[model samples]
Target chain A: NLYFQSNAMKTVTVRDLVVGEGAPKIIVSLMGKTITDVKSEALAYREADFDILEWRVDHFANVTTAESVLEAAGAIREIITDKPLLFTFRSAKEGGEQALTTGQYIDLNRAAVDSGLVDMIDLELFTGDDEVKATVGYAHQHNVAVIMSNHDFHKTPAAEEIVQRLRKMQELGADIPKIAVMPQTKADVLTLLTATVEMQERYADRPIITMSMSKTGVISRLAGEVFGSAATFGAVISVADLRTVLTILHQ
Target chain B: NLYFQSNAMKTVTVRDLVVGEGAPKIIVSLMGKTITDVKSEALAYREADFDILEWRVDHFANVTTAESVLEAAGAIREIITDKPLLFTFRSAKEGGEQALTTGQYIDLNRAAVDSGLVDMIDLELFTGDDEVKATVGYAHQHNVAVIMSNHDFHKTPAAEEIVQRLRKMQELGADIPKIAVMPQTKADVLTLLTATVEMQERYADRPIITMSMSKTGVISRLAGEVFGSAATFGAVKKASAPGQISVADLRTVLTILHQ
Candidate 1:
């Protein structure tokens, strides 16, 4: 049975940008196969309209190399110093390109959290509740916010299932609970949107992020302000268009 | 069995504005209680950013006087000469300010068409099938377009019903078919959108308008382009209905989405 628990929302702030208050913030993902390309992407995103830059570490060739990851993070910060940098290493199981053993993945995240270059880190849900809870504590210890997430690239989950997963993420003490699901039909998009509304109104204490991917589901992205999502992914592309759409809805 | 008919999308052209192509057109409704106010509304909307000016005749005080109605229509046309004028007298049963018998409504629309003052006329779908079809022919005979419409202000009809009504409007030879409904929830908005999609993709042969009304349903007005609606209503002096945005603000959103 689904029930409401008040989280008594405490807003999260990173670099002057406030999440959960006004129009949803845009987070642009960075892509690089090498350190040079990583630097190139950071330069390209230097004047982008998005609020945060997410360095998809899974796209980097040298994942196991701690120094290289840190070097890339520092370069991203040097170029795009105004925006908060979020470090994300999406696992292969979650529609990402790379995979790591459990200990290796935890070690990788622990190393990044210790570096202090990243303002936020994405820790996937279902990463063992104990492990996730410990990592969140570790992240808080370093003053870095955790954006705990889950993804369903193939199909949308039931509204109840979606809400409970978000609830579990909040219970596990994530700073932001996020989910991206693939909508197979318009009704599936509605399911995702309905789940978003229920979570924002009834359950969520802090900010949460939700989206239904692809063109067919793009309406969910535009309706976030009306539905209650705190953030959305953006360019590497469509930066101005995303800003325009957000401005229209926000006004 | 539901099957597709190639109405082949004969785009309706009203005063250099082409419907059923590119981004949806914007329609702003005029409000007035007297002939003076009618001319005042026309002057107010002369420079307004909209493709069509819809005179909501049901709001006028001197109705049933054909000469008075004709004078108001002529005044509006005299001031706002460029934009197409759409004559609409929404029935009281459909959330309008006034009620008219079948004969009165038909006569009003016929008079507007004959005056050559209006480029289009709105005929209610439930005004009796034969009466509606006859009025459609009368408008076409006078070289005037018919924007046939239906309204459900309490709750959204199912998508199938909405589509069939649109299909029936087309079957009755309407130049465009329009429907507006009230949404009770977020899901109800989807029902309107789904019906809009279903109507445009399968049944509708010409341009059509669909919206789920209210603040809860406001996005449907803005999202006509993506979901297959052909025009959206906006407000200038006043909003003639619920869920209408300011004309300038509506234009801004529509222009932004155009690119």
Candidate 2:
């Protein structure tokens, strides 16, 4: 009943190819261990056939020097001629194992966009509104899409509240709005899924990647496309199960 | 297929009321802001039309005081003696706003059971295993149904993990095994509901409560019964947790499901 609303700003086109009209998207994140060799990482991408390469710049072993960041981008640029690229400095607060000061993370994001190697950059919702505006501004200047995201490893918020949170992400210039909350019960999972459908119907803009995390939240990786989400993340190589069902959709 | 399996576990009949087999049981929770005044709560319960009234002892304004809690329970026992009553002390760690220390909370639980003021009592899984066994033992001594529950205010786990978690709760002398998780995406919600159906198929001993919190996870409140969940909590005033649909709303959902 709530899926037929006429309020939407933008539609998130995946790989700039599939235009989602209330259709969800899936993403496979290759953010586990760093690929020290840019070329080696490129090979992994070709072999794994991931929809996009989420370059975890924060996880790189030698990122102290700006030159290495550029070099890494350059190396990726060579192999990733057609596939889309996303740069993410996985913050420790967001359950990412990487640690980079906020300034450094912002600078690294800016640097990634400038390299013309990435198609998108991830910015956290808690990174302050002004910071989002600045990041979105810089990213737009370089043709890089901004994904406004949030992670609640603890619990899911109310439906209206979750929608409001995602709406704020849209307002903040996010090309994609993403939120991940931990579910404590079966009803909690239904609440999140039903809310996603409601939000997708109401605000059919850009792309929305809403999924749960940990062992319980893994299902978000498989069927997000059914609910109008643009992309879901999967681990390239990790103990956590990142296996998603949307790989066929990408094919 | 999971739904078919869920049909088998509804064999155990508590009070001749079959749970977890065919149709899910609909349990109601009355979450008033303060129940220090037992007489007022009893009056409200009769008017609310709830099948079962859950006394959230942890939510009392003065949960730290033992005598006041007994007074509250005694007051609730004065009226509405026909229907079943459930006593719950949601631990501070499990998303409850109760301000009492763990010791006070346990003592209050023991007092409620001893007074014969409740038909059942809920003990959170986060409490140590020893605490659970000890409390279950005490409540069982008094013929009080013990519901051992686990709450994850975070993301939903894998289906296997959920099955194992609920099975573990059932194994630990829980009259009903309950679990709650968050659903961040739509698919996650499906995974949770599917797990509830699957676990019901394999474990046929105790009633199980599987629910997801947050707005993304509310559909299970009404539909969980159909999916083999023995009981569900409906909100009276405010939602006890995330994604709680009102009882009226749940009625609409059930009508649709039945049709």
Candidate 3:
């Protein structure tokens, strides 16, 4: 990472959509269970509103086969031509659908980076420090942006803990550091929003994505521009609602 | 003022619309130079998007004539019979057009309260505490709710001061308290918002209105429901204020955020 260039401007450009500047960008997640399901969801989502299409690879049954993974990504690309594709195989510990060995997860990311089909790869921040660094460097060599990720499905972490995790991801060369935590109450959601603003204003030098999950935490997703998240999860949300709120908040 | 009774409920209700209960209400201001202008604006705004119609009385030329003031209120009430009508006479000290003496301002508001045509009136908090208290009682006697207001068109105040002003309005018996401050920097806007959260969380007894003005302050306007403001303003092309979203888009945004 060129600290000088990064320090100069902290945005990540994927295709024509810049991540950090302007109104927060919207992302849609696809959790299809098979190749047909992936293609079907891709076609359904082609006309839907979203800036990025995240393929939840952990939901794929044949993810162990490198060829199967590539074909599914290619099918999605064929159906949705304009948007950037984000490859992610969230491991089981982090609310993902499947579990993979540490080496398997790292190699799966390398395969996505080498395929030339995906524009970005999501690497879990806890995937072993050395392994995470190696894959990050390899992805950078292939010109693929890395979106470092962590998830807490049951409860939100402390504000300090969340900030530290996001900071560590930036240090490890992530193009965008993202975290999603579940809120047991409205206060937890506020804690998530508070952490996001602190990280953006006080610590982060680059774009970061954060969310407080569930209906109670919906405000954090829509108020990203005001509170400090660069992007919010959506189409999993009402695309119309997301687009409308962002448009109102944009000016 | 009975403090216990005032503390009984934190929300104000005018017509069937409960001010503090649901999605933040949208208010559009009508600033007409003459009676014809006022009537025309009300006719055009009758079917337009908004929850309340605020008549900017400072723009009226014949404000000294109490009968003419009643006539204008009657006209707006006739055209916009369904929506709640809010009477506001913003003094020039707070970015209004025509300046009014303290007595003139108080007398004008008293006339609106006595007319029985309007549902609510906005009285600036800085118009002296005793004057505000007396008017609050008069308006309450006439069943006209009061929206206590203060605006810093030049710069935002500290969060503590903002909250303090809101609390003062509450103690003065105003139905709802409001504050709008212009941002000197981006952080200034956040200070207003931080004040909003703190006031709602720790101090607010009822629904309060808050905004950081201008295009850069638009976030405060759009995210009212999330940030704890119970009402927001929108406008038509005849906007009296600066940097307001059109009523159509404002309703669209508030409706979406309501979900």
Candidate 4:
């Protein structure tokens, strides 16, 4: 049962940056109010040298329609250039700013992928099985990766339940499976880390992202190598601090 | 494989305190400069509610002869009462304060066992093979448990080497196989934790102790249940080693983990 003998992992390439190969890819989120603001925010990251840029579309004030989402994607792409851009429309129930109906969520994500602007799209797992399958199929057909995600702001689930959820994402053909849960105690965070390590070893064939949210779960973000997380989130303001932390993670 | 489904472990019973039953036991080391200081320091922990007490013999300035060691151990036993006392004389090569020749080291440990004051004795694995086997044999004959330990202050070895060392400790008739290492990177800490988890599942019939020492390896201390560590070291006055947590802090963390 010495399963860790093979450190071989399925690497996902986002332009020149390779995710899941060695050190975890640092993905910074862009939450600008206007198109100009979005462009400026992305340009700042060019010098920041983050691996991927996530456009939190729900935070974009002008992104009320599919066309506007596409337009914002294009503007961010113009400045962000070759870095992998992940399009995300976080829902209100899931700590997102916007409350999109089921159809609106599907349309916005489908349009983002069809526009060929996003390298990946975040599809919530609670969007019904049929909706999830449709979005995953469409994203793959357009050559865009799918990141099937689940978020719980209230509490963490049992390690078995979390692993089951991520495996379900893989069963739905997601290119990547991600989960983020708020920990009520230190043990809750440990449960999340245990689930991540177990899931990556037993079920996952592609890179997986798992986070135990908030300040208490910060170790989960930094100790990805130990817990089997493929990507980590960091703030742009603390990129230098993040670099220091990443150096420690590598050291 | 769902290896963690069964959490049954070989519980080393010291009176009513069962090590490796539920939460990891918090062991606070009492290092006093003299025999009188040792008694005073140990009595202070009467309210600390720690699971075990480790008396670092090398710290006692008067412990040059076996009589002095036994005398100090007897005084400490009165204050500590029923709490499990672990007699440890960490060697110099293993980053400990004491410097002892092989003969002196073996004789000191054998004397501790013969004194019958301590519930357990720590035997360093780097000690000569014949010395280790003889000491372990003497310890078991006296009904004293042995914690066979190894320490690497410089670097974290490969996972295989760490496992092999722990297994060797068990093969040498140790009740518990303990290892502590210095991690240069987060990956190094992970390597230690991974080896710990893997070793506990496959080879360890008794609870094992694996820690990545220093500030960078603090998670390994708190995440014992997840990684299968049976005991955690804490401090009362000053931390015995780098990144040693306070007993109060460890108690709170252990309570939360148990909940």
Candidate 5:
């Protein structure tokens, strides 16, 4: 409700690479718990040639201290200079496995955005509307684009409910709003994809990521982007007994 | 209607251990293309302490020849030893992946049960009424238990509809009426469980095996055990996802629950 009448969104452009604001880019975030060296990750991403590098900031070991977070963030910034950098200090309470308190998480998140070393930031949708409004307001002040997101580790809600929730997220002032819900059957995935298409056509001007998980839902991963989702994730390691995802494809 | 007055069922016991009149036992069958060794599969069942062994005769690579099935059934009877044996030659038309025509499936299923190889047989609920009645009558004449079943594998139907569907199976003379549906959410699982409980309390004079599947419906495996459904399946060797617990995990959980 607070957006401009025009269809342009706040854009994140790193080294002349632009996303959001009608930009067509497929972004994938690689999540790792403990990678001792940042250079290898950067090189792998470079070799992989992903358009953006999202350093899941909470996965670093020493992030309990402010010093370690800044150091890790800086190291990632230096190595991932060629592409837009996406930074997140996801909290354990917000679907992430990080152990930081809510205040520490927000503080560290604000610091990363203000450090002038990153182009974009990702925030959890469950972090409360007040926190999101405050954080996104601060990032806007710093010209750092923010992506607001939510995830349901369990089943997908009904189609109408899903559409309503995504619209609510957009109204909350998210640059790009994304959501993922678990699926129980083949039709549940269909429902999610249909809702995603409808939302993109009607309300979306920025990058929107909507997906359903589980074996039946895995079709959304490969087919999601073609259906208008701007990004998806895949397992680089063992997706044993796992469903196929959309982003990482191999012949 | 059919099994409403079945006096034979109350006296029958499954696995020679549990009395099915009031006991709940989860029935699981390994369904796939091939088994390298038939006896080996039965022995694995013995090791897992499963309540029953089903040959899912409809799967590819399963020997459907009259002689081959009779021999396999004999082995199963001996291997499952104390447990009741069940055989099914499910046709591809009824959500099964079998290559056999309906006539072939019925003939093979009949031979195995008549040979005293299987203690029971399974008949799909969606089959023709004449076919169903004939199969159930034949199974009963040979003193074999009949499991009348319906599988929606796609989605959970409305609660009243599921109840009526199970009632139709009961009316068809099913010794045990089984229905499995997929849930889209936790609330859907609740719908399945509630409906199962209501039916069990109302129309059922014999036992029923009602279950719900899918990632969202997973808790139904154990939860059904408590709410009035008989038995659930845990993974043995080959796994069927959607909510299969490893044997080790299932044993551990049930043991703790009983303790």
Candidate 6:
């Protein structure tokens, strides 16, 4: 009964697809050995018709420096011009391969925004509140949206805790808030879905993303519309699986 | 906020399996040509470890009179004495083969109860409020549980309406309220799930059953524990209802969810 009344959150547009309204945008991530390889992967996925593409910057071996990161971002940008590019530098503590100091992480994302090569930047929300505000400020100034994200690879947190974190992202002025949690039990995934539905209806004034990680949470990915998640992430599996999931989510 | 606390509900004992608590009970329905054939089918599903066996009385060719119905009920009772039997006489208007007036429907169910062979009876909630009360009252008098049910084969109704119908069932003294609606789209199924979750958490004092019928609504069946459905229905080959996953597949899915 307390669910929000379709307050019409701001819709962020990237290329042809519109986020935050209608069906959820399907965002597929790209991880490559080299800049050239990432471009080819983008091209192949472009043909796959994903609504958005996520570039996991830490995956590229050549992306040690800000200059190399921007260069790769540039190439992938050009390759997937038809779709929006979401630049993410996931840290090791947050289930990513890269380990970076706070300063390094802020500098890298700031450079990505300044390069004008990315449509959105994935800022780790727990990277200190100051960094979150500063990076979100810088991305907004540069007209590049920020997806403030939290990841719990170990286990899903409490329902209220997860809701509070996403609400914190919104309060911190990020364009969109996202969370991905590894569920140790089916109930954990249910908690995530319940939180998502409640937040999207009652608390969220912006489009949000939520995922219950791994196979157990697969339904959470497809049931985004029911649960009120604006976007979903999935692996590049067989074309049939991808097509079926997209069809189900779109419905 | 209105979701009920996990206050333990009545755990109706049906042999070894208890109906209304823990993991949702898997109920499978059987349709066969003769009493012997139905017995064999019950044996097959009994080995499958179904918690309850629903005998779709309308499907049995031999069930033209109360005497025949009692004989079949007795035969199936003997064969599947290990599991609970839920006797159902689905009317044609509600997507069953039989065409029964309200009086006929009430009589058939009351006979099933008086026979003392069936453990439960599926009384259509829309079979007139008076008949609903009478049948539920008679079933209770004989110590047989009542599953007051509503089925919409055409399309899912609005969320508030579905919740209201279930509430009315409880108000009318149904032991367990049930609903099955055909979902036209995925969002419709979501609406059903949302309603089920909200109602179970907020209003349900006893265990309830809800399903969004058809392939699109299959997720609601498997996510019963999350959505607060106490039981789910399935079948073997040639599903008695539209879009029912086989009992084997339902069990496998439920197992995965439990893990």
Point out where model 1 deviates above 4 Å: A1-6, A9-11, A14-16, A43-47, A79-82, A126-133, A153-168, A183-188, B1-6, B79-82, B157-168, B171-173
**How well does candidate 6 score on lDDT at residue A217?**
75
lDDT of 2 at A203: 66
Give the runs in model 3 whose Cα sits over 4 Å from its true position. Answer: A1-9, A154-164, A182-205, A225-228, B1-9
TM-score of model 2 vs. true structure: 0.51
Sort by DockQ, best first: 1, 3, 2, 6, 4, 5
lDDT head-to-head 2 vs 5, winner: 2
Please report, in order, the local distance difference test score of every candidate based on alpha carbons.
0.84, 0.67, 0.85, 0.81, 0.64, 0.78
What is candidate 6's lDDT per residue for A1-251, written digit by digit as tens?
00111336546666556687766677899998687789888877877756888999878786666677877888887787777789998987787877878888888888888888888889988899988898898888888888899999989999899999999999998778999999987667767887886788668888889999876676686666556788887556333354455454343
Interface Cα root-mean-square deviation for all models: 2.7, 11.4, 3.6, 8.0, 13.7, 5.9
Poorly placed runs, candidate 5 (over 4 Å):
A1-251, B1-12, B19-23, B31-36, B60-64
lDDT string, candidate 3, A1-251, tens digits: 11111544568888887888778899898899999899889999888878999999999999999999999989998999998899999899887888889989998999898998999999999989999999999998888999999999999999899999999999999889999999885557767877887888888888899998877678778777766788887774597689878877785
Lowest summed lDDT window (length 10), candidate 4 chain B: B1-10
On residues A1-251, what C-alpha lDDT tens digit does candidate 5 reach at each position? 01222255434344566554332354546455544465566656665635667777767776677777677667776766677777876667656766876677778879887788777788887777888889988887887777777777777788777777778778877777778888765446657876786777677766677878764454455444335566555433112111222112211
Ranking of predictions according to lDDT: 3, 1, 4, 6, 2, 5
For each candidate, what TM-score against the reference? 0.86, 0.51, 0.90, 0.59, 0.49, 0.62
Predicted complex 2: CAPRI docking category: incorrect
Which model, 5 or 6, shows the larger DockQ?
Answer: 6
Model 5 CA lDDT for position A69: 66
Residue range with the least summed lDDT across 10 consecutive positions in model 4 chain A:
A1-10
Off by over 4 Å in 4: A1-103, A106-209, A212-251, B1-8
Chain A agreement with the truth for model 2, given as TM-score: 0.82
In angstroms, give how far residue A57 of model 2 lies from its true place. Answer: 58
Q: TM-scores for chain B, in order?
A: 0.95, 0.86, 0.95, 0.94, 0.86, 0.92
TM-score of 3: 0.90
Q: Which pairs in model 6 have colliding backbones?
A: A4-A201, A4-A202, B2-B202, B3-B201, B3-B202, B4-B201
